[PDB]
Amino acid sequence: AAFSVAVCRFSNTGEDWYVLVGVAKDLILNPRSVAGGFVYTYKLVNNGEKLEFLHKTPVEEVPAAIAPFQGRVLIGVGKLLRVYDLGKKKLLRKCENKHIANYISGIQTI
Amino acid sequence: NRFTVAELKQLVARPDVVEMHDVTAQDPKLLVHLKATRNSVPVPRHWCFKRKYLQGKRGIEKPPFELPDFIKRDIDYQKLHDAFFKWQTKPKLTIHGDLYYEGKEFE
């Protein structure tokens, strides 16, 4: 599936623009019964006309947001907001907070 | 014929706002779930008290209504609206759910 997209940089990596897309897996609604989620990290190949499938970081909840929080991918999966960084094989959980009320269906970047 | 005060307090996922008298209702789980609202306001403190919140401390010792300075500091032409509608102070009271208790002002 797919429910979010962003094009941000990474302070750890270089200035190469990196895209991060969300994906659901068996997110059957009515009744709400999802199976999993994933985040695909592309390198934005072709200077904007392609994308290299770098890493598919899994998650036990359907992600619904992504945004650069001071140079980090702030993804809100279910009821948990986690700030991830550049991962050679998967998005590293640089920080986490599970104090979301019911579902994180958005995020802002102040 | 109902869940005990501990069984009905451990089965729920938020016993921090559990009440002893609430466990004897007809649907304790439903009441516990409804009491777990995000930012609601529970029942007042006069649920079980039989003093009506006025008979106990019936000897009130304080002024009835102090004149606010937002309007006090032909009646007035260039200063009446220029002191009440111009030099007005915003009343800073409770925001959302400070339900008045019995005293609620002395403590």
């Binding site: 590293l92 | 921090d16 009440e19």
Partner: protein, 107 residues
């Protein structure tokens, strides 16, 4: 003396606070008061469970331990969400926590 007042205010009743030194309190008025006091607080501190607001209406041993365990630091607010992913490989391996990668990079 006031037997009618005793039956009205809630006299002729007690409450067994086992965690509060197995004390014997009064009626419902002292029932809740027995959970927030000096003797009950000292008993809870000597038992090992911290004095939490969720454990106010609790009055037992096994139940107190179950509350101190289940209501302890759950999965939420973990150990800072450790995710180091040291540069020992630069292309694979990220399960190293805040201490594993430190020891891997120190030596």
């Amino acid at each position: 003396i006031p037997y009618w007042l005793y039956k009205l205010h809630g006299l002729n009743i007690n409450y067994n606070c086992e965690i509060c030194g197995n004390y014997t309190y009064r009626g419902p008025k002292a029932f809740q008061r027995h959970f927030a006091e000096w003797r009950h607080a000292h008993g809870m501190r000597c038992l090992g469970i911290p004095n939490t607001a969720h454990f106010a209406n609790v009055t037992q041993i096994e139940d107190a331990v179950s509350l101190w365990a289940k209501l302890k630091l759950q999965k939420a607010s973990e150990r800072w969400q450790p995710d180091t992913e040291e540069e020992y490989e630069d292309s694979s391996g990220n399960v190293v926590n805040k201490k594993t990668y430190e020891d891997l990079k120190r030596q």
